[PDB]
């Protein structure tokens, strides 16, 4: 669903979808070459 998502770092619109991407355990947020956040880790649990 397309909803407003804010986890501690940003307020924007987008759709959350599970993928096979893998992030380092010490990494939280990530961005593409366009300087837009394409992924957010769940604060409580481990999810990408």
């Amino acid at each position: 669903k397309c909803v407003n998502f804010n986890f501690n770092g940003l307020t924007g619109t987008g759709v959350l979808t599970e993928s096979n991407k893998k992030f380092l355990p010490f990494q939280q947020f990530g961005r593409d070459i366009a300087d837009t956040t394409d992924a957010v880790r769940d604060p409580q649990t481990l999810e990408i």
């Binding site: 070459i33 366009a34 300087d35 837009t36």
Partner: protein, 48 residues
């Protein structure tokens, strides 16, 4: 017959070995890709 067929065979070796002959069409994609990436990066600036 031997001159025409041999000249066509040199085209396959020229495009495979030398990739700079097609750079005229590569600049069209580069100027378009850099201009779009430039227009996006302005959103992160505070503009004073």
């Amino acid at each position: 017959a031997n001159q025409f067929n041999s000249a066509i065979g040199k085209i396959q070796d020229s495009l495979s070995s030398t990739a700079s002959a097609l750079g005229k069409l590569q600049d069209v994609v580069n100027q378009n890709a850099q201009a779009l990436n430039t227009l996006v990066k302005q959103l992160s600036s505070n503009f004073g």
